[PDB]
Amino acid sequence: MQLVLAAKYIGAGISTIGLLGAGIGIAIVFAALINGVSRNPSIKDTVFPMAILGFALSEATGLFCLMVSFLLLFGV
């Protein structure tokens, strides 16, 4: 096995591109909390908790595509 092994590294470097959704995604979700409390600092213990909930939702794309790389380097 050599030709099929080489495809394991090529496919692993491409599955990292799918992690952009977590970089820019979580950015926007967290950025809204910053702009939101800038116009209404009082409400805090209401938007902060839900903001974290959006994190785990956007962190999904950063986990699935992350596991795909291990299934081609330390998995297969």
């Binding site: 800038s38 116009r39 209404n40 600092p41 009082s42 409400i43």
Partner: protein
């Protein structure tokens, strides 16, 4: 400094004056707005809608004619309007339809007078939603 001092007054009667409020909901040009204890200083134009002053106890809700709303840096919102309207026990559906329908006929009348009719339509339609 805890809370926010509300100053809701009219050219005929003053309701609130330096009174602490938990939350207020007053329609703005940009859109519906809310305010609490500490709020960023914003100056928006109030449109003919419905305002509601909230308290720890059950909050009362009055209909507003329109004006301006300004939240002072020192945590002090000031509401300025013309006329006011109680919950619902004040307005009557029957008393509204009478003029409301007559407004559509104002468009039929000379435009000089129909100009004000268009402005009435809006205010009147919102009165119906207050019935809830």
């Amino acid at each position: 400094s805890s809370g926010l001092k509300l100053q809701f007054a009219l050219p005929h009667e003053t309701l609130y004056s330096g009174s602490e409020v938990t939350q207020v909901n007053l329609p703005a040009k940009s859109g519906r707005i809310g305010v609490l204890a500490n709020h960023v200083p914003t100056v928006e134009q109030l449109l003919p809608g419905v305002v509601e002053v909230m308290e720890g106890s059950n909050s009362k809700k009055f209909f507003i004619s329109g004006g301006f709303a300004t939240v002072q840096p020192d945590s002090q919102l000031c509401v300025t309007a013309i006329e006011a309207f109680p919950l619902e026990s004040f307005s009557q559906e029957n008393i509204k339809n009478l003029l409301a329908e007559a407004k559509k006929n104002v468009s039929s009348s000379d435009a000089r007078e129909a100009a004000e009719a268009a402005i009435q339509v809006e205010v009147l339609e919102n009165l119906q939603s207050v019935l809830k």
